Enzyme design. Sequence first.
Site, PDB file in Angstrom:
ATOM      1  CD  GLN A   1      -3.014  -0.927   0.213  1.00 18.01           C
ATOM      2  OE1 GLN A   1      -3.433   0.186  -0.139  1.00 18.01           O
ATOM      3  NE2 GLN A   1      -3.467  -2.059  -0.308  1.00 18.01           N
ATOM      4  CG  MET A   2       1.998   3.709  -2.030  1.00 16.96           C
ATOM      5  SD  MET A   2       2.608   4.703  -3.404  1.00 16.96           S
ATOM      6  CE  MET A   2       1.448   4.275  -4.702  1.00 16.96           C
ATOM      7  CB  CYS A   3       3.760   0.955   4.219  1.00 20.75           C
ATOM      8  SG  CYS A   3       4.324   1.268   5.902  1.00 20.75           S
ATOM      9  CB  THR A   4       6.544   6.133   3.149  1.00 18.96           C
ATOM     10  OG1 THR A   4       5.679   6.677   4.152  1.00 18.96           O
ATOM     11  CG2 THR A   4       5.909   6.383   1.789  1.00 18.96           C
ATOM     12  CB  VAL A   5       6.710   4.521   8.046  1.00 16.54           C
ATOM     13  CG1 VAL A   5       6.769   6.018   7.667  1.00 16.54           C
ATOM     14  CG2 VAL A   5       5.257   4.085   8.237  1.00 16.54           C
TER      15      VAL A   5
END
Lengths: 316, 316
Positions: free
Chosen positions: B207-211
């Site tokens: 989920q395009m987690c950037t973290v």
Amino acid sequence: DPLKIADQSVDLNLKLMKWRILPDLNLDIIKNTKVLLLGAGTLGCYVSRALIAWGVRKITFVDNGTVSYSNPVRQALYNFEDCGKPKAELAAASLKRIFPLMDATGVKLSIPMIGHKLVNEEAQHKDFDRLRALIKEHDIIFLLVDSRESRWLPSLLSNIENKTVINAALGFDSYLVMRHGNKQLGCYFCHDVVAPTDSLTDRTLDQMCTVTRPGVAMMASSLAVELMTSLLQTKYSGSETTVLGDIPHQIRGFLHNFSILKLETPAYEHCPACSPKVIEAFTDLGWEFVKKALEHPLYLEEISGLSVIKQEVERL
Amino acid sequence: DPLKIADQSVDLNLKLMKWRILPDLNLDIIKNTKVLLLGAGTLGCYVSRALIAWGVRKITFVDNGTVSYSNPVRQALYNFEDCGKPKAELAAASLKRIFPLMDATGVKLSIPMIGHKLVNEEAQHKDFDRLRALIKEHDIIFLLVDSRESRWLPSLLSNIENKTVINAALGFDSYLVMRHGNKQLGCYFCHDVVAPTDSLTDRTLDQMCTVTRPGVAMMASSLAVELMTSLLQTKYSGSETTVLGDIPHQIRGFLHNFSILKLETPAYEHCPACSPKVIEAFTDLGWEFVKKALEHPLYLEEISGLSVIKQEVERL
Ligand SMILES: [Zn+2]
Ligand SMILES: [Zn+2]
């Protein structure tokens, strides 16, 4: 100002991890952790990259080696143009190229291998003191050396100085990641971490196999760092878990069947590295003890009480 | 000649792996494998480093992005001084700094996300053709994008061109590595790779987690490459194993409890990416089909036969 922005960027990335997903995550204790890496090979390179992504600010590499022609493809801080240069300081310089305000330094220093005669009593005496100083100076020690015999001195010293230690060891297609400890857990040396009866490829563990499958060092490095970050978190009451999950004693991974095992071992009474008599002996005799143990491993077994154990077996 | 030596060094390292440990290992098929990496982010960077250690000679990065201030600590081909520069070509240049005789190239190209209106019908039409060309040109496609919706077009096209595909997807603390396939296995899209009922942190997958936790991308990258190398080896008679071990369909890893699961899924009849009607539709209508599917995902479900399934459910 670009540099200030690059700084604000990474702390911010980490804080968003905390507040978006894990509010109980303690990020400062990770950032302020002084990390000593013994080994600037494949493990040291990958471990350092994982550490800086977690915001670790102070990292010290220790390696006596030089960048070889085959190194850069496997060891992720070096370029072809670096070939010949001294590894540790190069590793530090490479980190600062990624992230300029890192407190990264390299020390060129040899670690004596147990079972080997000394080459220069004086030089290595110095190096021994220097090694102890670095260990006392730091918070977490990663043991990322190529063989069992280079593991002994730093283990002992890390126990003496009460530092958390994280070992990683590679074989052809498997790896071991374990923490020694700050019912005590026991160190790398407490028990056979591999049996004389196991597989041939499993016996390559920590024997400086130069031909491991590339993926082994990547997996081991990241687990070791993920183990460190979890370990730095406060534990839950009546539970061996933190906000980041488990804190196993040991992790063993295998590439051939893509598996991971967790296990735990108690401290052994006649360990050559952490047994009370070995501590007592080191505390009483210092380098004189170390020197004798290094050149004569069997002396170590008299001290530990391991020999007397082996002799009561023989007597049956 | 230093460069020739650096070459002879790495092929030699690999040949010693073969003859010391795995005589049946086929190294040439790995070296000659043309690899396309869709994504030059954290996954693309780590996957490429693992590939070159395995001796892969031709690697092509595809990314439309630019190096940001936070990128270098997580994305292992970029330095602070690279900030602002175009990612893909930079990634290629960085590989050649490690290993100068690499056939590494970067292409700046966007991949359309399904569910989004087109911004420039013509520009993206070009990009679509270009993407298909790159896929046909190469042998193994790694899908290393940040979300599910960027995965769809390359999946379809890779199936159309009969290329082996390897997906990697990240969540906060878990990852998925799977191969689509050259009883068919089925692709990323065949089944829910995560349930609406599962954990909140497990739903961050792709989920395009950037973290994400830094270690997640390292683990996933190395498994994906180790999966590729095994997969390229001949299979044993009556066995889903090769000289390198297993070739699972899917690998799921979890950091919180340091576990890995292997699982397998059959191809689904109404898959939006690989079902016969979707193939037929693409073969008959081309970009006109793709364009409509991209802007109108529900059209895709009419084609696939998924809608008629959902309607016979409603009718009960
Ligand atoms: Zn011990
Ligand atoms: Zn499918």
